[PDB]
Amino acid sequence: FKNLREFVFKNIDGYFKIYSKHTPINLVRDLPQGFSALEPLVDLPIGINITRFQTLLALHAAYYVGYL
Amino acid sequence: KIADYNYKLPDDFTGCVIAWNSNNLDSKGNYNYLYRLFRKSNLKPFE
């Protein structure tokens, strides 16, 4: 599953910052070593206080979660 | 009450506030227009 989709989500001053980078990997069980950079993608001036986070999935999926 | 519960501004707010008197366009006793009077904490900016 080479499409490794890394994302960073931040809600600062009523703005949503999205950083992403799609890179080809071959280690799905764990996170491969190395270095990369995530580029700014979208700025969303919403104004919502986000305290909970829920992934939306299609239904008739292994992922990772850290904190900054 | 207003600065903390109804509309909260950042303390570094670089902006302008414009007030339009509308006694002829909003007054009735118009009850549909309220204000927030009580709250346990202070609002965040853009909340």
Curated annotation (Swiss-Prot), chain A:
Glycans are attached at residue 49. Changing residue 30 to G: In strain: Beta/B.1.351. Changing residue 49 to Q: Increased resistance to neutralizing antibodies. It comes from the Viruses. Attaches the virion to the cell membrane by interacting with host receptor, initiating the infection. The major receptor is host ACE2. When S2/S2' has been cleaved, binding to the receptor triggers direct fusion at the cell membrane. When S2/S2' has not been cleaved, binding to the receptor results in internalization of the virus by endocytosis using host TFRC and GRM2 and leading to fusion of the virion membrane with the host endosomal membrane. Alternatively, may use NRP1/NRP2 and integrin as entry receptors. Binds to host ACE2. RBD also interacts with the N-linked glycan on 'Asn-90' of ACE2. Cleavage of S generates a polybasic C-terminal sequence on S1 that binds to host Neuropilin-1 (NRP1) and Neuropilin-2 (NRP2) receptors. Interacts with host integrin alpha-5/beta-1 (ITGA5:ITGB1) and with ACE2 in complex with integrin alpha-5/beta-1 (ITGA5:ITGB1). May interact via cytoplasmic c-terminus with M protein. May interact (via N-terminus) with host bilirubin and biliverdin, thereby preventing antibody binding to the SARS-CoV-2 spike NTD via an allosteric mechanism. This is Spike protein S1. It comes from Severe acute respiratory syndrome coronavirus 2 (2019-nCoV). The gene is S. The chain holds residues 186 to 270 of 1273 of the full protein.
Swiss-Prot record, chain B:
Changing residue 38 to L: In strain: Omicron/EG.5.1. It comes from Severe acute respiratory syndrome coronavirus 2 (2019-nCoV). Changing residue 35 to F: Decreased HLA binding to NF9 epitope. Increased binding affinity to human ACE2. Residues 30-38 are annotated as: Immunodominant HLA epitope recognized by the CD8+. It comes from the Viruses. This is Spike protein S1. Changing residue 34 to R: Increased resistance to neutralizing antibodies. Decreases HLA binding to NF9 epitope. Increased binding affinity to human ACE2. Binds to host ACE2. RBD also interacts with the N-linked glycan on 'Asn-90' of ACE2. Cleavage of S generates a polybasic C-terminal sequence on S1 that binds to host Neuropilin-1 (NRP1) and Neuropilin-2 (NRP2) receptors. Interacts with host integrin alpha-5/beta-1 (ITGA5:ITGB1) and with ACE2 in complex with integrin alpha-5/beta-1 (ITGA5:ITGB1). May interact via cytoplasmic c-terminus with M protein. May interact (via N-terminus) with host bilirubin and biliverdin, thereby preventing antibody binding to the SARS-CoV-2 spike NTD via an allosteric mechanism. The chain holds residues 417 to 465 of 1273 of the full protein. The lineage of its organism: Viruses, Riboviria, Orthornavirae, Pisuviricota, Pisoniviricetes.
